[PDB]
Amino acid sequence: AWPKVQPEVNIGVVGHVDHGKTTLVQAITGIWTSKHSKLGYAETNIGVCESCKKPEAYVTEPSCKSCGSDDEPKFLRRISFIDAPGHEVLMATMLSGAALMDGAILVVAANEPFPQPQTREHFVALGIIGVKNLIIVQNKVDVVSKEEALSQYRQIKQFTKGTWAENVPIIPVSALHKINIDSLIEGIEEYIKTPYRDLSQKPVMLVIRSFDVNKPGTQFNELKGGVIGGSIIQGLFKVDQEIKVLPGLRVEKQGKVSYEPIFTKISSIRFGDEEFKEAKPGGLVAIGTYLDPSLTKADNLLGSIITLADAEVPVLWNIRIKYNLLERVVGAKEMLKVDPIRAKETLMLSVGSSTTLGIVTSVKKDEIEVELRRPVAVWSNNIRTVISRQIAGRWRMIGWGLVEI
Ligand SMILES: Nc1nc2c(ncn2[C@@H]2O[C@H](COP(=O)(O)OP(=O)(O)O)[C@@H](O)[C@H]2O)c(=O)[nH]1
Ligand SMILES: [Mg+2]
């Protein structure tokens, strides 16, 4: 019997619309992520049939029938996938990507010219947020000749050559007909390994959703505290731990604007449909709390950072960022130059995957100083920052950096 454990790794699935992201996640997990009426999420166990040859030995359920054996397969690990509905939701979650994803799959349709517009954008975005454990999946090989597939494969290798992605593998599949999916599972095991995690690091969690789960007319004894949804960035949380929500509540007192942390306690921990006593990075987690549900209703806490109640975590209104920029971005028409950062500019800053607006107060060499609309939690040195600028009416990623404390 396979164990019941949390996912230990989260994989973002990106690529141009209709290239087959959701079909691919279904082929792997058996789950259709967009059966909802907001992020698609799906988990699967991964195993291997010890006496079978690879890649067919790799399986996603406890059976070896797919490789002609009656044996029970060995359990390797549980993994999960993030699959967004549409470009705008996807790009929005990419701003939190570093916290959410241990790796990524870029889906490329074999029957469309490469690269498609969102293909280019998603690939650039992955570099910016630093999620570079990448697999490129060449999908829909069932509707082109082997020659056409081979030709596109070589275009892609030419594209990645000279970039950070030069050594990224390309795995051809048909998500629809489940062809060569076992090769992809094998590739996930090789190229998106579970990271080394130092579980003695101070616990930090990003909040991506918050809920009031009480139906109307719920009686007193059946009421629940506010529920928080998110991803554990580092460390380990436990049931019954005291925690605080950062920066907290915005307050106007003694002639100043300030933020007061929200203190509470973890009542329960859930991954998918199982309850746990602890929670580590990997997977999206649901945290039950003792919060008044009015504080969590309608994603009120979205973008909060959660730590233990006594954590020494600075919450800063002004930050210094050491950064680098893109040379150009793709305009709807054609290439737009990325202008240097100038004082007084308004930027969107994603700091350790929590996002706010800010005004540049100083620029020198490769550092900026920014005054933020609300303050950000900074729990270590070299917290990665995404810098975005409004270009032609839209926020665009233009750079990345590290927060210097
Ligand atoms: N022929 C073929 N069609 C596919 C394959 N994978 C997906 N499709 C089709 O492509 C369309 C878009 O797929 P979908 O998973 O919704 O793409 P997404 O927008 O990237 O999530 C659907 O009609 C799928 O059935 C494949 O491997 N072969
Ligand atoms: Mg989809």
Residue numbers in the entry: 2 to 38, 48 to 415
Please quote the paper that reports this structure:
Comparison of the structure with the wt-aIF2γ-GDP-Mg2+ structure shows the transition between switch ON and switch OFF states. In the GDP-bound structure, the magnesium ion is still bound but three water molecules and one oxygen of the β phosphate define the equatorial plane, whereas another water molecule and the hydroxyl group of T23 are in apical positions with respect to Mg2+. Changes of the coordination of the magnesium ion are correlated to the structural change following the loss of the γ-phosphate previously termed the loaded-spring mechanism. Overall, the conformation of wt-aIF2γ−GDPNP differs from that of wt-aIF2γ-GDP by a rotation of domains II-III with respect to domain I by ca. 14°. This rotation is partly due to the movement of switch 2 helix, and to the subsequent remodeling of its interaction network with β17 and the following loop of domain III. In addition, transition of switch 1 position from ON to OFF causes release of interactions between domains I and II involving the strictly conserved R219 residue.
In eukaryotic and archaeal cells, the initiator tRNA carrier is the e/aIF2 heterotrimer. In its GTP-bound form, this factor specifically binds Met-tRNAiMet and brings it to the initiation complex. The γ subunit forms the core of the heterotrimer and contains the GTP-binding pocket. α and β are bound to γ but do not interact together. We were able to observe GTP hydrolysis by aIF2 or by its isolated γ subunit.
